[PDB]
Amino acid sequence: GSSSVTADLNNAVINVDEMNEAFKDVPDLEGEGAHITLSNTTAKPGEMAEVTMSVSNADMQWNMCGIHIIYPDILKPEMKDPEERTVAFQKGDALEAATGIVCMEWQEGLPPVLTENKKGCLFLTAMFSGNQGGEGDMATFRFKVPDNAEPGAVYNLGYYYMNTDLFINEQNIPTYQKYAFTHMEGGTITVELEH
Ligand SMILES: [Cl-]
Ligand SMILES: [Cl-]
Known part of the structure; x- marks a missing residue:
């Protein structure tokens, strides 16, 4: 089908097959759809x-999210309180109206698919009052690119999919969540060439 082949071509979710399995009994939204993306810098x-x-394509359409962002573990995210595993971030316009936002680094008890592929992970959750989720930038982080x-x-x-992760409206419409997760795009950091 369209939307699960859409997710295979974006190669954004590391455990995409598991995800597609989870969504197998949910039909595709008809038609669109929030577009979640990471940056390419x-x-x-x-x-x-x-x-x-x-x-x-999400302004006033959503209510909360809980998303796992992944990256090579040689990259180290900038931290707010290491002791609390809070990750420093700059909130964007998309989260302007959020009643709460939290962002943490998953350090311990990572699943094999991540550990075995040497991936690090952080978890971003945001909540709004009703469908006041915005659009544009959600959050901006910083990662240490290794000196060498x-x-x-x-x-x-990219992303890691966990059964309980969310991108939803107040009414918890399953097709809405499916669209968002199956159309998410990853990102990249590319190291510049020599001068
Ligand atoms: Cl990655
Ligand atoms: Cl930051």
Whole structure:
């Protein structure tokens, strides 16, 4: 079908098959649909590189999210309180109206698909009063690009799907959630070439 082949071609969700399985009994939304995306940027070796998650076609259409962002574990996210595993972030316009936002680094008890592929993970949850979710930039993070990073190196940024993760409206419409998760796009940090 369209939307689960859509998710295979975006290669954004590491456990996409598991996800498609989870959604197998939910028909496709007809038609569109929130578009969640990560950024594609260039950085120098050793740089604190900015990464931004954003969403389009969602203004006033959603109520909360709980999303797992993944990245190569050699990248280290900038931290607010290491002791609490809070990740520093700049909130964008899409989250302007949020009643609460939390963002944490998943450090311990990561699932095999992530550990075995040397992926790190953070979890972003935001809640709104009714359907006041916005659009545009959601959150901007920073990652330490290793000092010794090779020019041209590409760090893929994506998602991990957990059964309880969310991108939903107040009414909890299953097709809405399916669209969002099956159409999400990953991102990249590319290390600049030598001068
Ligand atoms: Cl990754
Ligand atoms: Cl930041």
